[PDB]
Amino acid sequence: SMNPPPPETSNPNKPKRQTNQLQYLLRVVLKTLWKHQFAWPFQQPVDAVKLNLPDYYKIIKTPMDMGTIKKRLENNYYWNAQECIQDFNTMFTNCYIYNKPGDDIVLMAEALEKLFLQKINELPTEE
Numbered sequence: 001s002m003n004p005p006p007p008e009t010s011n012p013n014k015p016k017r018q019t020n021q022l023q024y025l026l027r028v029v030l031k032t033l034w035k036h037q038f039a040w041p042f043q044q045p046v047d048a049v050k051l052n053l054p055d056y057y058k059i060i061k062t063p064m065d066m067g068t069i070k071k072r073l074e075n076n077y078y079w080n081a082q083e084c085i086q087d088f089n090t091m092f093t094n095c096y097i098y099n100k101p102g103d104d105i106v107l108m109a110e111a112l113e114k115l116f117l118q119k120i121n122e123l124p125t126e127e
């Protein structure tokens with residue numbers, strides 16, 4: 001399509017672990033953000049066709065979204081929490097790259113990011 005293949009959510013040869021922090025990221029961090037009133041644009045990969053953003057994947061070369069992150073967590077895709085947190089960071093950063101300060105979508109991302117920051121502050125220690 002005008003859309004690239006979505007980011008993988010499984011990769012059999014990638015090393016992975018379950019850690020208490022990754023569990024936390026799924027059951028609390030992801031879950032909380034997912035139910036937020038501003039979550040909906042971020043619950044799936046950007047559909048450049050449907051949303052009429054033909055320039056999106058000209059600009060964003062490392063796409064990420066909470067839908068991909070959710071599956072990745074459900075599929076135990078990650079080696080550690082930092083890998084997952086990086087995916088969240090990429091998603092926010094993409095939004096701030098593609099869009100303008102004060103855009104509705106940026107306001108939504110900003111709200112989610114500050115909530116994200118609160119929630120990872122409460123991340124349980126790891127070993």
Ligand SMILES: O=C1CC=CN1c1cccc(NS(=O)(=O)c2cccc(Br)c2)c1
Pocket residue numbers: 041042046051053094095098099104105108
């Ligand atoms: O950059 C990202 C990351 C996730 C979605 N987007 C994004 C960015 C620009 C436009 C749109 N299209 S839209 O229909 O979802 C839309 C339009 C106007 C306001 C709001 Br809120 C939402 C989506």
